[PDB]
Amino acid sequence: DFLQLHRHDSYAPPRPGTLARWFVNGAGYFAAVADAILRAQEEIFITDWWLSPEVYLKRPAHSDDWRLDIMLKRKAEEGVRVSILLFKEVELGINSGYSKRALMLLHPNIKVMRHPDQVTLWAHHEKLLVVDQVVAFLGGLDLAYGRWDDLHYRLTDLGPDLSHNQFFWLGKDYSNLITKDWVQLDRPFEDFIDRETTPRMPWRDVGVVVHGLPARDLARHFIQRWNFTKTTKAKYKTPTYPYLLPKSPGGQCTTVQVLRSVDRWSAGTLENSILNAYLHTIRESQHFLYIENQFFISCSDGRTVLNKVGDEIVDRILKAHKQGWCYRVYVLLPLLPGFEGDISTGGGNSIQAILHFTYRTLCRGEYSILHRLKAAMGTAWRDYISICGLRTHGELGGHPVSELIYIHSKVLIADDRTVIIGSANINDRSLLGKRDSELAVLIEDTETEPSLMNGAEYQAGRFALSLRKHCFGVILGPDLDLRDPICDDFFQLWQDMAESNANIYEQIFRCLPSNATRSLRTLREYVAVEPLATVSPPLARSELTQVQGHLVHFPLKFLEDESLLGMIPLEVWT
Template sequence: MVAIDQTVAFVGGIDLAFGRWDDSQYRLSDLGLTEESNHVKTSQKGNGVTEGPKSDNPTKQDPAHLDGNTKLWLGKDYSNFIYKDWTNLDKPFEDNIDRTKIPRIPWRDLSAAVHGCVAKGLLDLIISCTEGTTVKNGIGKAVVDRILRAHREQKKFRVFVVIPLLPGFEGDISSGGGNAIQAILHYTYSTMCRGQNSILSKLSEVEDRWTEYISFCGLRKHSQLCESLVTELIYVHSKTLIADDRCYLIGSANINDRSMLGDRDSELAVFVEDEERVPSVMGGQEYEAGPLTLALRKECFSVLVGASSDPSINIDDPISDDFFFLVWNETAKMNTTIYDKVFRCLPCNSVHSMLHLKDYSCQERLCNTDPEQAVEELKGIRGLLVHFPLKFLCEENLQPPKNTKEGLAPSELWT
């Protein structure tokens, strides 16, 4: 949080760190090009970065001569922390990675600005709050209970989960990613779909119909970098919950024990509940929505499913079958299929073991073998949404070995 003169406060999950600023274009490159292209053509193994043949119409700009205000991300602000973590932090204006070869990881955050007595109240809270009531992390149970209730009552209910495709640690995912990445993946999958305490295991009563109630997705982008085609995940860092088009929560807390137990990390959030109402639609019925919440939800959905560039995509009714199945899930499915076909991206739902991962990573990519066909395939990409690969390395134990520094660390470090 940043509070100014006790009159305005900015609250959200964004860190004061390199690589955090971004806009809705989520650029993968920063060489001073005037236009972001969707034609892809290079590769670095790991993180789904792909290398292919040169373009027939190479750019005339020389990256070596692009400096100062010609770049949006100076020095280490141009970052791909999964490819390489930051080093030499005392030299912030020196590049940490080769921006002519490695795409940056775009960053998605949401924040809120509050004014007047609310801003002063947030500041007073930080100064005076030394004790609190007992807090428990009941979010997963609440999601399960609400889905089971909807299932038993035969009513529509949807949960849209959007998270990073990979943890924010350095590691080559084509060889497994390393102990830190695997440890985070272990606990992520344990929450969502693996083990008896996961959300999907607790939804066993629903069986395969869980897909009617909850969706797990990530975000991905493709572009052109120095005459080559590249793709990279978008790191979802926003800690935001939007409910019923009437209220939303924006803050610093993750959905994990570290943020939610109340005795570990200090977190702050603003809860906004609309008092006014505007006509809307929910589940095919007339519905009174909150204007601020409705606008926020539609702005987010518009970017993710591509409605911002295709007005024919209707995002008015978020829980209707048409939107949930034919827009949201179909967009994620289509984009995932195309990216896997063109780039053989990782993580991937079809890779279940380390042995399969090694074989998968060695196979040729369409962008290398048939670049013209790759470009045609990529024209089908809509928005940023892709499915989160729930079966990635599902046959492996992703907990770090006990004889490693990651394995010696307590589970609280990762959760």
């Protein structure tokens, strides 16, 4: 199975008959992770870009039960060997030193290695937990603060002996990473933003659990990285860090293939099979793509942006337009990048740098998707691609408040039949292989159910259709017909709701980003106006009843008059 590369040049072959189950949001994912830890008998393997030891896997907490570090300590006390690989930041505020020391203190059977020790731009980004080399969790969710959430996407959490606790996010877990970055992680149960005045930011993400052969394949990636990391410095070469060896509930039978991005620096071998699977899946798609991703930085110029995901999307749309076939691309992006900054004053240079490359993919310049579509078909591009974000509202301090829903997912769905779930963002950092290390699974359905595709009967895949309908249903908010994802009536309904919700949120909250602020000049005057939410809470509440779902148009004109791009290498942002 591992003497030679496979489909998409992956180290692992496709695995038919694999039981797999998807998760939307951290609540179900973290609870299933907890259940799997509890039943571990031999080994637990964990990779994290950030691991918060005191995070709770089930909420709300009333004791030390379900706290990550306590759960791992008890399993280690039972004889389970826990092996953990953490990213070593440049003291970023993730504080891997605190995580390492806390985990190593728990029990002698828990071993942690950090990497890299050299200065580099790139990171270990994959999120993985494997139990007994037979059950594997992956996706966009780190076992970290701020990640737990559910369909309620709560903006508030108002209700150390925890017996009477009612909070869902204790201490550092209550957070809004755009308002303020994490500080003082060695004080896990102390707030660092004002619960009474400062809404948290909802976190949307996608995970998956796979059983059997793909879980063993994922264990083999962990083992390869573990044994490679042993050789990186003298402390890790000793038997204190043992050589690891491959061991030769709602799940759907599928065909699953593991994919990864790794390089010499990260694993001692080269692979970019996530990128390969993305390009092949887009090229071979026949009806639609649904893309929910934290980043959308693509369209190659051969110099500053290299990955061709955006280029394959353009070619696929142009091909469908040339042949006269119905084809839709849904892109769901976070309305603002997840960096600390004040968007009312422009957002700061980190936010603006990401915004620059985001709009470069979307609609600004010769390489953008919309410029190349407009060139071939003019205004008809709106028939083939819709770019949206998510927003919600609640109440705090006696008046409505609003916040974007942070899309941290890294998922693609094609044709209601194929799904890619992993850690890889759509940017060069995740996809080129040479930069950040990443994991993903390509999930192809072999079992189907009768559905619709532009009005015709269509055998859709069970795993993909259930996931796609769950995304659409949450995003759109009973009598909605979600069977057909590309027919004219539904696509119009999608665009109408995205525009209607965006207009209402702008009328009530004057929230940013917005097409109303195309320069920093106009932004300065725009934010000096008090929004209706606080001027007249009753009038604001009445208008907010017309919102349905969370879908909002992604404003394509925000700060379009500014350049948005000093000595940091540009590849930091791509």
